Amino acid sequence: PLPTGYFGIPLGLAALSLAWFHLENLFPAARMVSDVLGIVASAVWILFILMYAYKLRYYFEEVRAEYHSPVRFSFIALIPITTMLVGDILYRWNPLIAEVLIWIGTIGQLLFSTLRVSELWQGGVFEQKSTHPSFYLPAVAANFTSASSLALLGYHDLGYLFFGAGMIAWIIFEPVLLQHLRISSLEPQFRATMGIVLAPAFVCVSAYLSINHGEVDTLAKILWGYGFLQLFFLLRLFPWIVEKGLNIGLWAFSLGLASMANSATAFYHGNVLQGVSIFAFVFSNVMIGLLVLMTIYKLTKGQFFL
Amino acid sequence: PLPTGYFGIPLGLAALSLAWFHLENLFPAARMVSDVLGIVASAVWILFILMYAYKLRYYFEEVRAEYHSPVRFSFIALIPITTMLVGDILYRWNPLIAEVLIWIGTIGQLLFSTLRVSELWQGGVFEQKSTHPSFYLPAVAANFTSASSLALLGYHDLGYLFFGAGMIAWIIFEPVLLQHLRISSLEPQFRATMGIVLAPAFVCVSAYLSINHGEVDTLAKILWGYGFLQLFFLLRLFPWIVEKGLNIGLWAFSLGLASMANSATAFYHGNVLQGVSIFAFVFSNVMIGLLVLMTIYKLTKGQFFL
Amino acid sequence: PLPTGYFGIPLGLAALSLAWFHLENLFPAARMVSDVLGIVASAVWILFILMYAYKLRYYFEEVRAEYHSPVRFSFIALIPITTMLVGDILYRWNPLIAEVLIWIGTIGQLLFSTLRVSELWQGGVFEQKSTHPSFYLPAVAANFTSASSLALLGYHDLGYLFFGAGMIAWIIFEPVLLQHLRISSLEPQFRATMGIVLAPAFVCVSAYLSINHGEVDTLAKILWGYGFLQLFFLLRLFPWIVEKGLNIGLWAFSLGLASMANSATAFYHGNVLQGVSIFAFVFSNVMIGLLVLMTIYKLTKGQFFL
Numbered sequence: 008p009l010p011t012g013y014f015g016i017p018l019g020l021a022a023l024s025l026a027w028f029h030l031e032n033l034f035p036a037a038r039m040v041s042d043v044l045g046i047v048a049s050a051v052w053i054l055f056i057l058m059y060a061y062k063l064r065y066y067f068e069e070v071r072a073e074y075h076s077p078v079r080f081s082f083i084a085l086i087p088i089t090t091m092l093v094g095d096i097l098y099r100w101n102p103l104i105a106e107v108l109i110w111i112g113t114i115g116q117l118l119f120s121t122l123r124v125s126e127l128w129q130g131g132v133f134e135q136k137s138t139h140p141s142f143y144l145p146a147v148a149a150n151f152t153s154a155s156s157l158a159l160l161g162y163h164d165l166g167y168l169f170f171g172a173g174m175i176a177w178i179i180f181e182p183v184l185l186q187h188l189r190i191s192s193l194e195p196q197f198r199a200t201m202g203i204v205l206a207p208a209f210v211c212v213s214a215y216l217s218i219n220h221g222e223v224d225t226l227a228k229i230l231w232g233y234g235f236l237q238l239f240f241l242l243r244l245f246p247w248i249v250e251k252g253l254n255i256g257l258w259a260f261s262l263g264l265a266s267m268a269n270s271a272t273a274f275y276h277g278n279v280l281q282g283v284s285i286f287a288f289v290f291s292n293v294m295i296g297l298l299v300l301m302t303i304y305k306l307t308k309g310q311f312f313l
Numbered sequence: 314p315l316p317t318g319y320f321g322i323p324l325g326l327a328a329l330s331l332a333w334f335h336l337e338n339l340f341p342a343a344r345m346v347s348d349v350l351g352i353v354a355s356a357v358w359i360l361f362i363l364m365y366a367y368k369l370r371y372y373f374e375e376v377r378a379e380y381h382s383p384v385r386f387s388f389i390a391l392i393p394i395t396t397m398l399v400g401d402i403l404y405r406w407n408p409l410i411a412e413v414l415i416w417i418g419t420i421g422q423l424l425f426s427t428l429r430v431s432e433l434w435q436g437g438v439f440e441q442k443s444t445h446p447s448f449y450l451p452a453v454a455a456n457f458t459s460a461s462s463l464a465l466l467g468y469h470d471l472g473y474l475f476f477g478a479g480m481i482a483w484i485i486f487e488p489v490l491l492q493h494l495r496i497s498s499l500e501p502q503f504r505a506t507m508g509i510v511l512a513p514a515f516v517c518v519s520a521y522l523s524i525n526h527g528e529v530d531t532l533a534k535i536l537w538g539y540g541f542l543q544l545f546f547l548l549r550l551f552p553w554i555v556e557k558g559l560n561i562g563l564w565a566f567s568l569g570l571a572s573m574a575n576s577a578t579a580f581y582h583g584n585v586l587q588g589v590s591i592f593a594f595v596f597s598n599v600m601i602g603l604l605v606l607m608t609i610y611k612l613t614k615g616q617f618f619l
Numbered sequence: 620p621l622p623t624g625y626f627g628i629p630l631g632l633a634a635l636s637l638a639w640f641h642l643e644n645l646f647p648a649a650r651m652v653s654d655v656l657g658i659v660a661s662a663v664w665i666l667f668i669l670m671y672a673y674k675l676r677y678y679f680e681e682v683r684a685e686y687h688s689p690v691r692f693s694f695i696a697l698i699p700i701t702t703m704l705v706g707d708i709l710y711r712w713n714p715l716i717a718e719v720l721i722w723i724g725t726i727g728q729l730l731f732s733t734l735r736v737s738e739l740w741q742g743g744v745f746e747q748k749s750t751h752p753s754f755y756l757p758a759v760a761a762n763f764t765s766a767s768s769l770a771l772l773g774y775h776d777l778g779y780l781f782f783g784a785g786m787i788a789w790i791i792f793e794p795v796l797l798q799h800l801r802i803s804s805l806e807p808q809f810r811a812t813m814g815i816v817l818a819p820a821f822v823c824v825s826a827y828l829s830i831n832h833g834e835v836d837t838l839a840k841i842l843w844g845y846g847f848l849q850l851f852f853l854l855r856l857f858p859w860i861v862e863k864g865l866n867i868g869l870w871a872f873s874l875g876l877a878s879m880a881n882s883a884t885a886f887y888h889g890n891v892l893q894g895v896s897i898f899a900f901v902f903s904n905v906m907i908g909l910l911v912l913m914t915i916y917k918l919t920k921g922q923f924f925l
């Protein structure tokens with residue numbers, strides 16, 4: 008079927024729904040915006056889940072190949088990540104169904120990493136050229152997503168465990184990723200995944216603020232600072248990133264963008280850097296809006312599905 | 314003599330004695346268990362120290378070779394680490410003798426790293442293939458051990474310095490270690506040392522809780538989360554680790570296991586994740602119990618000493 | 620002109636002026652010492668700025684080459700760093716002019732890194748052999764300097780953003796730097812830059828204490844611990860560092876030394892490790908004093924300028 012990376016679309020939309028949700032008491036109309044984005048993300052997730060179920064049943068060898076690949080395996084983590092985010096959305100309407108989805112996605116991502124990420128340490132399969140930003144998905148983003156989802160359900164201390172796993176995994180991987188990028192020019196076909204480099208600090212602070220009841224403290228400010236540094240670097244790099252043209256892979260940026268938006272709501276609520284917060288929230292919405300527009304355009308030309 | 318790595322045996326036993334010690338007021342019988350493990354660890358340490366003194370006097374070129382090796386040097390750090398842990402045990406009976414051992418081990422480990430770990434930065438001796446988990450011993454575990462031992466003696470601020478040295482050294486080394494493991498299959502003869510990968514987060518949180526008066530805070534929960542992630546990964550990898558058979562090298566795991574047990578006592582005392590704490594404490598005791606049983610078995614067959 | 624690295628001289632002197640400044644209320648005579656060092660640093664900075672302006676106008680291709688070099692570009696960051704430090708000095712006399720310099724240096728360093736540090740991620744220019752301690756200048760030291768300068772002006776939350784950018788950039792680069800040093804013997808002509816390895820933890824804690832109102836907390840103690848570990852390692856390595864002779868490049872050490880001095884004033888004020896603080900402050904002053912003496916000597920022999 009469907010390329011596994013397309014789960015980035017409901018991921019980005021779902022995460023953006025949750026960001027707007029957190030503005031509802033400052034600005035009541037934010038709830039309708041959140042509900043609309045959340046319904047659209049959920050519908051797209053349902054479709055993509057059904058399509059992936061079909062892939063498993065009738066194209067299993069494609070799934071097997073992607074699973075055993077030391078690079079492509081990572082995109083599978085998008086499935087449980089999006090499952091948890093849809094759970095977080097649904098919590099506003101039905102906490103029971105939300106909790107089921109959150110546990111399925113949590114157990115699923117932990118099983119996934121435990122099976123596949125650890126296996127890499129056997130050596131001889133992963134190569135230096137396998138050192139791609141997509142590795143953040145199973146290693147980092149999945150753990151932060153479990154952290155914030157478990158906090159939503161009231162399991163704050165368990166959430167902190169998943170939080171720590173993601174934060175330390177991030178700091179442990181990024182050094183070798185950035186060195187690899189410096190030495191080796193990432194080929195155009197993979198370059199859109201540079202957008203995932205935006206994610207770690209913003210997804211980290213978003214998850215942190217979810218678990219710590221929105222307390223904007225020293226750690227949060229530290230994370231925002233490195234997050235904005237990476238944003239500036241990626242903005243400068245953008246023309247290089249899209250050297251060979253705009254493409255649907257640019258949804259890679261939506262994880263970081265939506266988390267910039269979510270964290271910005273908490274900085275704003277805490278009266279920390281409110282002007283920066285407004286900029287971050289507007290910027291991220293405009294960019295995801297542009298992703299949506301370019302996606303509708305592609306669907307319009309029959310250039311969406313493979 | 315005696316392979317230097319055999320100091321891992323009294324290390325694991327001593328650390329486990331200290332874990333049980335910290336349960337004595339919740340469960341008084343824990344003290345007898347702690348005292349027994351502590352006496353056995355101390356007796357084994359005495360024997361191994363005397364044997365290593367004999368190695369220094371009559372097999373000095375073997376010591377010299379191990380010292381100058383960019384891989385084997387690390388195991389020497391087990392000597393001052395175990396010396397400090399025996400000091401921590403003895404403190405319950407004789408604080409004066411305890412303090413002497415703790416300072417000997419602290420000054421010894423710091424001198425050792427200052428001489429040998431820094432020397433590696435001259436280049437040309439350490440190679441990519443030298444990137445082994447054993448490096449954590451002089452670089453990380455030795456500093457955490459000094460931190461907690463100095464805290465025991467009431468030198469908390471000095472303990473925090475050693476703590477920071479170990480924590481930042483850990484985060485600075487692990488990125489390149491895990492990348493190396495991914496690319497290069499660690500040969501079977503070294504694979505038991507994968508057990509040292511369990512140690513950092515647990516030894517870190519154990520030392521931290523020792524210095525901060527057992528306050529189970531955000532940092533502690535973060536460390537436990539990454540610690541359990543690594544545990545799960547190593548459990549999945551275990552059949553690969555022991556591909557060529559069970560061996561005495563598996564005492565490599567005891568450092569992390571004993572620190573899981575120790576930290577679990579503090580999480581339990583703090584009423585944080587008590588169910589996880591009970592599991593961690595029981596699991597680690599069972600695994601170290603299995604190490605002891607397999608060791609008695611080897612001694613029984615005359616397959617212990619070289 | 621003038622080698623760009625010579626900006627390390629007013630950098631080291633300016634930073635040391637700020638350290639003495641922070642003793643003025645414990646020891647009033649410290650103010651005169653601070654004022655003298657600050658005037659000398661400012662005068663040297665003025666001279667070097669004018670000389671670099673001349674280089675830009677009449678030797679532009681030399682500047683272009685250094686800018687595009689994946690190793691030599693880093694020294695350019697010394698210009699905005701020193702500009703901010705001179706601003707911090709001048710603040711005691713004229714806060715308006717100080718603020719102008721601080722914003723010029725902040726915007727300048729951020730623009731510099733955004734343009735050049737990010738560009739490295741395109742690959743194919745930076746090589747493994749490009750992995751030099753000088754990279755800390757644009758990546759780490761510049762951000763910490765902005766953090767503390769902005770805090771001086773009362774912009775603490777913005778300062779925390781720059782702080783986080785520098786701290787996380789540090790932890791992200793150092794792993795690959797130390798692995799490179801282990802494997803590859805850094806050639807003598809670059810070895811004096813090993814002194815920059817002293818800087819990160821001390822510049823970090825100095826900036827942190829500037830933003831957090833001098834509160835010597837757990838993070839501060841942790842940073843000092845790793846800072847002293849690196850000091851000990853570099854002391855052991857010093858004879859290797861200067862294998863081919865003493866040279867003006869040794870001003871590389873002044874960044875870390877001056878930050879040891881500055882942070883020591885805050886530990887002393889906070890009654891934390893006062894004995895260590897006194898040692899650190901005296902040691903760093905003696906070493907920078909020796910740099911000054913060797914520099915006067917070189918100027919005396921006409922061996923200073925190229």
Ligand SMILES: CCCCCCCCO[C@@H]1O[C@H](CO)[C@@H](O)[C@H](O)[C@H]1O
Nearest residue numbers: 063070071072073074075083086119
């Ligand atoms: C999201 C789900 C991804 C799962 C991919 C599973 C990869 C399976 O792996 C395969 O399992 C087979 C049995 O069915 C074995 O024959 C093979 O040895 C093994 O390659």
Ligand SMILES: CCCCCCCCO[C@@H]1O[C@H](CO)[C@@H](O)[C@H](O)[C@H]1O
Nearest residue numbers: 083086087115116118119122123126
């Ligand atoms: C998102 C949900 C993911 C869980 C899917 C589990 C599929 C793994 O399946 C297992 O993986 C092993 C290697 O890692 C292989 O031995 C086999 O394919 C199988 O044992």
Ligand SMILES: CCCCCCCCO[C@@H]1O[C@H](CO)[C@@H](O)[C@H](O)[C@H]1O
Nearest residue numbers: 178224225226229786787790836838
């Ligand atoms: C590589 C990752 C960087 C980690 C930075 C951790 C910073 C922790 O910082 C701590 O936060 C508390 C709340 O504001 C403060 O009260 C403490 O005094 C402060 O040190």
Ligand SMILES: CCCCCCCCO[C@@H]1O[C@H](CO)[C@@H](O)[C@H](O)[C@H]1O
Nearest residue numbers: 268271272273275276284285286288
């Ligand atoms: C998380 C970032 C998005 C938050 C949106 C805030 C936009 C509101 O804008 C603000 O409204 C204030 C009062 O409500 C006015 O006082 C401010 O001047 C104005 O900037």
Ligand SMILES: CCCCCCCCO[C@@H]1O[C@H](CO)[C@@H](O)[C@H](O)[C@H]1O
Nearest residue numbers: 369376377378379380381389392425
């Ligand atoms: C635990 C103790 C380990 C110490 C190992 C010391 C390594 C000594 O090193 C050697 O010292 C000799 C002198 O005795 C010199 O001749 C040699 O140059 C040097 O290799």
Ligand SMILES: CCCCCCCCO[C@@H]1O[C@H](CO)[C@@H](O)[C@H](O)[C@H]1O
Nearest residue numbers: 389392393421422424425428429432
């Ligand atoms: C656990 C106690 C350890 C301290 C032992 C110190 C032995 C080091 O000895 C020194 O090491 C140098 C290289 O690193 C060599 O020059 C020589 O062997 C010697 O100078």
Ligand SMILES: CCCCCCCCO[C@@H]1O[C@H](CO)[C@@H](O)[C@H](O)[C@H]1O
Nearest residue numbers: 174175178224226484530531532535
């Ligand atoms: C790479 C290493 C990860 C470091 C994580 C540091 C987390 C510090 O976290 C801090 O702990 C305090 C105590 O609970 C809190 O009050 C602070 O608000 C919290 O930020």
Ligand SMILES: CCCCCCCCO[C@@H]1O[C@H](CO)[C@@H](O)[C@H](O)[C@H]1O
Nearest residue numbers: 574577578579581582590591592594
């Ligand atoms: C550090 C982990 C080991 C701690 C051992 C705890 C085992 C005790 O077990 C517990 O006893 C409680 C009261 O004492 C009972 O109320 C609990 O239900 C029970 O789980």
Ligand SMILES: CCCCCCCCO[C@@H]1O[C@H](CO)[C@@H](O)[C@H](O)[C@H]1O
Nearest residue numbers: 675682683684685686687695698731
């Ligand atoms: C501190 C200031 C450093 C700036 C160095 C600038 C490097 C300029 O770069 C050059 O700019 C030229 C135009 O002037 C172009 O022709 C070139 O493509 C480009 O190499």
Ligand SMILES: CCCCCCCCO[C@@H]1O[C@H](CO)[C@@H](O)[C@H](O)[C@H]1O
Nearest residue numbers: 695698699727728730731734735738
């Ligand atoms: C300390 C103040 C530094 C700011 C100087 C900016 C000089 C950069 O100039 C730019 O750099 C690009 C590559 O990175 C090149 O395209 C060109 O030289 C130019 O566009």
Ligand SMILES: CCCCCCCCO[C@@H]1O[C@H](CO)[C@@H](O)[C@H](O)[C@H]1O
Nearest residue numbers: 480481484530532790836837838841
């Ligand atoms: C790789 C970088 C290491 C980061 C270490 C972060 C330590 C944060 O530590 C926090 O500091 C506060 C102030 O003292 C305390 O109250 C917290 O309880 C303590 O955890």
Ligand SMILES: CCCCCCCCO[C@@H]1O[C@H](CO)[C@@H](O)[C@H](O)[C@H]1O
Nearest residue numbers: 880883884885887888896897898900
């Ligand atoms: C930051 C490190 C430099 C601080 C300099 C301190 C030197 C003063 O020295 C100290 O003076 C005290 C009272 O003023 C005496 O009581 C102490 O015994 C003495 O050590």
